[PDB]
Amino acid sequence: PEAYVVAPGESLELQCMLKDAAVISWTKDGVHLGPNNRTVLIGEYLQIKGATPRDSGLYACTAARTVDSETWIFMVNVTDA
Amino acid sequence: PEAYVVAPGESLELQCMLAVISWTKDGVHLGPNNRTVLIGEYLQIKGATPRDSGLYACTASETWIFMVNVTDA
């Protein structure tokens, strides 16, 4: 679990992994993340523009396929510090 | 984020911490089934297969998180 500092207003960008036939699902603090006006999920990428401090949290992407289900975690701290 | 490694075939058991507990895996809400039992603060899934791995999380505000790794390693 690696740390990511994002300055408020900037873009949080996370990248999961490349596995053939694996569809990527994202969580923040265990809760599900999907697409919205500030959230885009594409390929193995997660983008959130307009970082605010409550965007801070423990993000994780799980690449699941039928055979297996591998997982990466990112600790995101959105701060002016 | 707590680590839990289980060997395939064995029983995956999670125990929540610090109220009625609801479990998610990779964001999806879990209920009981023929290999899953949810009781008290416990989550049990028997017959672990590598696809049972994922990011589990238990909540009642407060939330506790588990990275489950099912491997023979």
The enclosing domain of B51 has a CATH number of 2.60.40.10
Q: How many residues does chain A have?
A: 81
The reply to whether B51 touches chain A by the CB within 8 Å rule is yes
| Cα distance between residue B61 and residue B22, in whole Å | 12
Pull the structure tokens for residue B67: 């990275």
Q: Measured between CB atoms, does B53 come within 8 Å of chain A?
A: yes
- Domain containing B39 equals 1-73
Question: Given CB atoms, is A2 within the 8 Å cutoff of chain B?
Answer: no
Q: Where are the beta strands (DSSP E) in chain A?
A: 2-6, 12-15, 23-28, 31-33, 39-42, 45-48, 57-64, 69-78
Of A25, A78, A22, which is closest to residue A48 (Cα–Cα)? A78
Query: At how many Å resolution was this determined?
Result: 2.9
Q: How far apart are CA B14 and CA B25, in angstroms?
A: 12
Question: What is the Cβ-side half-sphere exposure of residue B62, based on CA atoms within 13 angstroms?
Answer: 6
Residue type, B67: M
Long-range contacts of A33-38 (CB under 8 A, 24+ apart): A33/A59, A33/B27
Give the count of domains, chain A: 1
- How was this one solved? X-ray
